[PDB]
């Protein structure tokens, strides 16, 4: 069914005889020649150390946030690392993740009992999912948590860690609030799983097109114009001819767009 146009015609009609006429048998396609990867040429490694290896985390009633920006975050050393008992990614696949680009990736860090880390989920209402750390419905981002009994647990009980239990309506996702409202923990090395302190970090990012700043560790390649090429701009992939354009963009916008929601113009990241 690809030897010559006549044999292709026979295959389309499912016959060994073809009557006189004109037949539509296939579709002509030009194939892409090479690949184009264009990422911003920032090179600073990313300070995940000061988040993951912090000496003492914050307590979940007043969970922390750190800005991650202007870094080329190699997420592989995270996913390759074995200490994480729970690396769960929503709306993004962890192996594919390393090639993408982000505009605001946020690290939230707080310590909770190892038993209830399941309540770190988009729904799953509970004493900490409502009054302490409400996780928004259906976001994109990975929740990475680990055991901390070696570090944050005191013989005779560790009471530095507090979680709010309160008597009103839960307010909003991603909002911290500052009978008595604050309950101490009882972290002890004698305590096994359950009542066991787990250190939790949730990386929340957006994966939408805007000028990016936290990209993957992918080397850029020179860009070739006026020929069918397979391009990759900041995680945007496709096939097409790249030409110079007179479309007047504005600093807050990088991506043009078509009526049918396909991309129509890109801004060269460099």
């Amino acid at each position, epitope marked *: 069914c690809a030897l010559d146009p006549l044999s292709e015609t026979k295959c389309t009609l499912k016959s060994f005889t073809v009557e006189k006429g004109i037949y539509q048998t296939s579709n002509f396609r030009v194939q892409p020649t090479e690949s184009i990867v264009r990422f911003p040429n920032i090179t600073n490694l990313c300070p995940f150390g000061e988040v993951f290896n912090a*000496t003492r985390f914050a307590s979940v009633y007043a969970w922390n946030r750190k800005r991650i920006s202007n870094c080329v975050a190699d997420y592989s050393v995270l996913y390759n690392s074995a200490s994480f008992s729970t690396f769960k990614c929503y709306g993004v696949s962890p192996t594919k993740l390393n090639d993408l680009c982000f505009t605001n990736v946020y690290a939230d860090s707080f310590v909770i009992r190892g038993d209830e880390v399941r309540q770190i989920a988009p729904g799953q209402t509970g004493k900490i999912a409502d009054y302490n750390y409400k996780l928004p419905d259906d976001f994109t981002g990975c929740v990475i948590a680990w055991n901390s009994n*070696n570090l944050d647990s005191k*013989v005779g009980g560790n009471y530095n860690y507090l979680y709010r239990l309160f008597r009103k309506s839960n307010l909003k996702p991603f909002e911290r609030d500052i009978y008595f409202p604050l309950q101490s923990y009882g972290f002890q090395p004698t305590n096994g799983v359950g009542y066991q302190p787990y250190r939790v970090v949730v990386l929340s990012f957006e994966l939408l097109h805007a000028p990016a700043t936290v990209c993957g560790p992918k080397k850029s390649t020179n860009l070739v114009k006026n020929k069918c090429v397979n391009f990759n701009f900041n995680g945007l992939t496709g096939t097409g001819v790249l030409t110079e354009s007179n479309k007047k963009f504005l600093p807050f916008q990088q991506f043009g767009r078509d009526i049918a929601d396909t991309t129509d113009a890109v801004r060269d990241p460099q």
Partner: antibody
Amino acid sequence: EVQLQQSGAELVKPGASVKMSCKASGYTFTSYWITWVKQRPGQGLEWIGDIYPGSGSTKYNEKFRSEATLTVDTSSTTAYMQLSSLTSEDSAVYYCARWDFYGSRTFDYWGQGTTLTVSS
Amino acid sequence: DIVLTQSPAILSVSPGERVSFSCRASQNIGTIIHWYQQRTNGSPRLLIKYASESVSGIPSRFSGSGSGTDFTLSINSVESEDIADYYCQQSSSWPLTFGAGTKLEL
């Protein structure tokens, strides 16, 4: 009284390792961490690693990822640092120290100054 | 990794007159900073518990200021009794680091 005592002094030909020890006294050995540091005459201090005496855990500096190994004995209320494959660049002054991880994260108690002389 | 650099390499000093040190890191630490001094024998002692406030065990002659990246130490009145070198140090995230060293001399 709250104080950390030091092992003493060694004269050692290069190649032969040293076991070093840190006599804790006068405090709750199970609620304070232990931290080891080393410096050289005319040079500043460098951290090597820490141990939680209450329950087994350890953190190490990368520049001493294999040379230093740290251990503790709660019953004797003492900590130990072992150095392997000593060199003339290991001729250094070592201080044991107390670290209050759960407290203010400070080096509130130290040794009296241990000088390790390595001579070929 | 955090790098802690001390700008005043050497200050020539005379007793009584005001002298001030500063510490410049590579990035934000928060407020978990300490200072240690080394008499010529080599025994350290605590001076600054947290970056801004003096520890309860030190006279109020010593005070700290700044947070995050710019840190400073001031001497209210210097004397030969206070001949010492000050090390900037941080303990917020592993690994624990130390300073470079600043000297006092007549």
